[PDB]
Amino acid sequence: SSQAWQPGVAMPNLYKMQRMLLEKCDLQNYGDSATLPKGIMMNVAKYTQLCQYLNTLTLAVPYNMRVIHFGAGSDKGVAPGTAVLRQWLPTGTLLVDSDLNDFVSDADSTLIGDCATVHTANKWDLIISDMYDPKTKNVTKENDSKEGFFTYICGFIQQKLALGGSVAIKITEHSWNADLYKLMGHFAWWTAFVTNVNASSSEAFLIGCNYLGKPREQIDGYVMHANYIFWRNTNPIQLSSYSLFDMSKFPLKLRGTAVMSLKEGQINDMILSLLSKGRLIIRENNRVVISSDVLVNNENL
Amino acid sequence: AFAVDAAKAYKDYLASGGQPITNCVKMLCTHTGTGQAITVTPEANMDQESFGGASCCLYCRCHIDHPNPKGFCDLKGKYVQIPTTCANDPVGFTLKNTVCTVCGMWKGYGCSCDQL
Ligand SMILES: Nc1ncnc2c1ncn2[C@@H]1O[C@H](COP(=O)(O)O)[C@@H](O)[C@H]1O
Ligand SMILES: [Cl-]
Ligand SMILES: [Zn+2]
Ligand SMILES: [Zn+2]
């Protein structure tokens, strides 16, 4: 293979360059399962492979890093993905997580409610989303770009992602948004990453690597999602848990990436080059303050 | 005067044959770590499993106040190493056992401080 010993498979660049039409996703291995190590949950394995892949990219890793994780609750009432992120991230990293339903978490702070109720004063160095509604898996209806939490995520990135920061946002055949693909062109690099443990699913993480705050490439998101599905439809990925057994190089290196505050007028080509290489983060370095909007109602008489 | 005693309730439920709390979050790790009980990153040795701390805390999992005037949690935001022989019930293990304040090992499951 070669591929079976990786944490997963990233969309090859040539598939990004196509102009495919959207088809139904029909995966050959749809129903295969990886053999997980004894007692290990799918969500731990999936997040572990995501982080192993992110270790291969040029993520900025400043002191006093700030990471926010949407869709972090499980139907079990715990947060396995958050637990993996906290293991991966340098000790001391500020980690906030959130979900619609109540759950217990290892994050530094947790907000319960619809993601649209979440507000933050500060900018973030990394945004992870596992948000998903399994109702979208209806093959009897047309597969159009979805709004909902994707509309929130797009605005949140444009308003609250530090220049230089990165994102990993979970999509599927039916859970996707064209504007989010378009926003991938505002990063120095991007891909769609499929974990080897969950390769039987049309799930992927759309990863934007080093945010530039402006279009570097113009992407048509309807077309790009068709390109992604074409890739999946024609490239069966062998289910594999092999990478889970080598955790010796798992921790994210604390690079001490520089953080500066800068005004739009100061973002020259040399700055943009440092951003693009994972060598600079642009944001305020103030205290991290978050909140959840609460709707108040009195239902008496 | 009245306070719910969740610890005693779980101990008695277990002695009566109740199934231990499940879905504690087990971490992947090298299993070449220090073996200390509660750490900022997984530190299981060959004879332990590492778990996300909040998922192994009776008070976190039951949604009840922590028995501590400040309500602080020893486990949330950390990782807990559980002997593999006791990993079927991490919440029971952390409830019933104590960490040596000197070496950070579990009393009776790694602490050698009382040796000659
Ligand atoms: N609009 C939303 N705001 C916040 N969390 C959401 C939203 N939609 C879905 N989620 C969460 O996303 C998670 C998806 O995980 P799963 O359903 O296990 O793939 C669930 O815990 C949901 O509660
Ligand atoms: Cl419970
Ligand atoms: Zn607790
Ligand atoms: Zn000791």
CA distances from A136 to A101, A139, A193, B45 (A): 19, 9, 20, 43
Give the SS3 label for residue A3. Answer: helix
The H-or-E segment that residue A109 falls in is: strand A109-112
CB contact at 8 A, B39 and B78:
yes
Residue B22 phi/psi, 5-degree rounding, is -110, 180
The closest of A181, A258, A255, A191 to A224, measured between CA atoms, is A181
Q: Which two tokens stand for residue B66?
A: 């922590």
Q: Which two tokens stand for residue A233?
A: 């439809």
Interior angle at CA A188, CA A59 and CA A262, nearest 5? 80
Contacts of A41 in chain B (CB under 8 A): 25-26
Round to whole Å and give the CA distance between B19 and B9. Answer: 13
**Which value in Å is the resolution of this experimental model?**
1.8
SS3 labels along A64-95: CCEEEEECCCCCCCCCHHHHHHHHHCCCCCEE
Q: Which two tokens stand for residue A70?
A: 């949407």
Within 13 A of A189's CA, how many CA atoms are on the CB side? Answer: 17
The closest of A118, A1, A39, A35 to A71, measured between CA atoms, is A118
Q: Which two tokens stand for residue A237?
A: 């990925």
Residue B78: closest C-alpha in chain A: A106
Do the bridges between strand A66-70 and strand A124-129 make them parallel or antiparallel, or are there none, so unpaired?
Answer: parallel
Do the bridges between strand B38-39 and strand B79-83 make them parallel or antiparallel, or are there none, so unpaired?
Answer: antiparallel
Q: Which amino acid is at A111?
A: L
The closest of B30, B62, B32, B104 to A247, measured between CA atoms, is B30
Mutate to test the interface with B, among A87, A88, A93, A196 (most CBs of B within 10 A): A87
CB contact at 8 A, A32 and A207:
no
The closest of A289, A284, A288, A276 to A259, measured between CA atoms, is A284
Catalytic residue positions of A, numbered:
46, 130, 170, 203
Residue A18 phi/psi, 5-degree rounding, is -85, 175
The H-or-E segment that residue A211 falls in is: strand A204-211
The H-or-E segment that residue B94 falls in is: helix B90-96
Round to whole Å and give the CA distance between A45 and A201. Answer: 14
